[PDB]
């Protein structure tokens, strides 16, 4: 009863502390640490957290980042249906973020363009041309402002031109960091309670 | 080949008109701003290569365009057609914050101005319910903006267009203030095309 209220409070503190450390690892390109921290958070989810809309946003972000971090591994499946590559799965999470964070198409569009682009190109690098075409056609926009990129890609899949500048100039690292940038902007900048108490406590000590 | 040359020229062209768009906006020549804005809109579909400088210029251009049409509540800049121009400008400001990697402190005062204008303009045009929604959606989470919103709420509740807050609101001052904030994040360089024109003016 009370013991569960108290556990809830701690669990949320734990969750927020690790989320903060997960973003820091991600920002520092320490993806190994990111994944391990991600697993700790995954384990905490079966426990009572209560309600904060702060954690749902928190969790939607982790969700998207987790899929983006494993984006270059087409052996991974974050979904019921094996079909979905991690990035395709990231697109779906982004759509959930749009709806839940009540964001406009214009705001989510830039992010999305980057994820769709990355999804197609990673498939192309693995010469999963057929898969790249399907992803391109279902997701890719046909906007007048993206039609050239879409045509280049469609053509690259055509000739299987893995040597095309579009493919060679693609930086997954930059892609990842830009995505973190965007997702990060829908979160508060505060220091999680535990890190605060850890900075205090840690300086009780000395010498 | 002659197709990487296009990308280079499209950039000079885009940066030239950007320079003239700001000049116009800064002179309150909004008619000229709009005409120039449309040239830039047509250019967007053409290959511009990618350059951090043009990506920032059109975010600013996007913000200014919504602000310039801020009083036309009949204009829709978004798929979600219920969004008023200034509401759209708020979002562009958020994308600018994110993309220009600006701190909240740097952006917050400017965002407040746009939110305030969005509600007040709606009020002056008698769109009371809309003003109410914008106020509730954008000004309720800010403790730093308490007596402005409770004042606006009562203004909306009593339909007091005569209230000093509404009567003394200057949209011109707002526009110019927004330009100054936006310009503060841009290079000062004279566009290449204007430089060459001034030169061609030497001899002839």
């Amino acid at each position: 009863a009370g013991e569960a209220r108290l556990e809830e409070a701690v669990n949320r503190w734990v969750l927020k502390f690790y989320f903060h450390e997960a973003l820091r690892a991600f920002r520092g390109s320490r993806y190994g640490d990111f994944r391990q921290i991600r697993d700790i958070m995954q384990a905490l989810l079966v426990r009572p957290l209560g309600k904060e809309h702060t954690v749902s946003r928190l969790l939607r972000v982790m969700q998207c980042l987790s899929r983006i971090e494993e984006g270059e591994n087409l052996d991974c499946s974050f979904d019921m249906e094996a079909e979905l590559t991690p990035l395709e799965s990231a697109i779906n999470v982004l759509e959930m973020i749009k709806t839940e964070f009540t964001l406009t198409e214009a705001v989510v569009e830039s992010s999305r363009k980057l994820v769709k682009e990355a999804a197609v190109i990673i498939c192309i690098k693995n010469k999963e041309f057929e898969k790249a075409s399907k992803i391109l056609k279902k997701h890719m926009s046909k906007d007048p402002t993206t039609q050239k990129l879409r045509n280049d890609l469609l053509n690259i899949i055509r000739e299987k031109n893995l040597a095309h500048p579009v493919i060679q100039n693609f930086s997954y690292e930059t892609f990842q960091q830009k995505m973190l940038r965007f997702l990060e902007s829908h979160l508060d900048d505060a220091e999680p309670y535990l890190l605060t108490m850890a900075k205090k406590a840690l300086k009780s000590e000395s010498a | 080949g002659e197709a990487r040359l296009e990308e280079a020229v499209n950039r000079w062209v885009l940066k030239f008109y950007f320079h003239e768009a700001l000049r116009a906006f800064r002179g309150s020549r909004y008619g000229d701003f709009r005409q120039i804005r449309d040239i830039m809109q047509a250019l967007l579909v053409r290959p511009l290569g990618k350059e951090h400088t043009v990506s920032r210029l059109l975010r600013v251009m996007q913000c200014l365009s919504r602000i310039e049409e801020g009083e036309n509540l009949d204009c829709s800049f978004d798929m979600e057609a219920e969004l008023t121009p200034l509401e759209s400008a708020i979002n562009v400001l958020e994308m600018i914050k994110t993309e220009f990697t600006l701190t909240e402190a740097v952006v917050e005062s400017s965002r407040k101005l746009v939110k305030e204008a969005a509600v007040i303009i709606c009020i002056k045009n008698k769109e009371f319910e809309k003003a109410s929604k914008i106020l509730k959606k954008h000004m309720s989470k800010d403790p730093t903006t308490q007596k402005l919103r409770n004042d606006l709420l009562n203004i909306i509740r009593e339909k007091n267009l005569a209230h000093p807050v509404i009567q003394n609101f200057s949209y011109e001052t707002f526009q110019q203030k927004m330009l100054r904030f936006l310009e503060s994040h841009l290079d000062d360089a004279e566009p290449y095309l204007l430089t060459m024109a001034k030169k061609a003016l030497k001899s002839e």
């Binding site: 402002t145 | 809109q41 967007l44 059109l58 969004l83």
Partner: peptide
């Protein structure tokens, strides 16, 4: 759509 110009019209709700 890094659209600079309006996409269309909005239905004012004035009166």
């Amino acid at each position: 759509s890094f659209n600079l110009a309006p996409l269309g019209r909005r239905r004012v709700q004035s009166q």
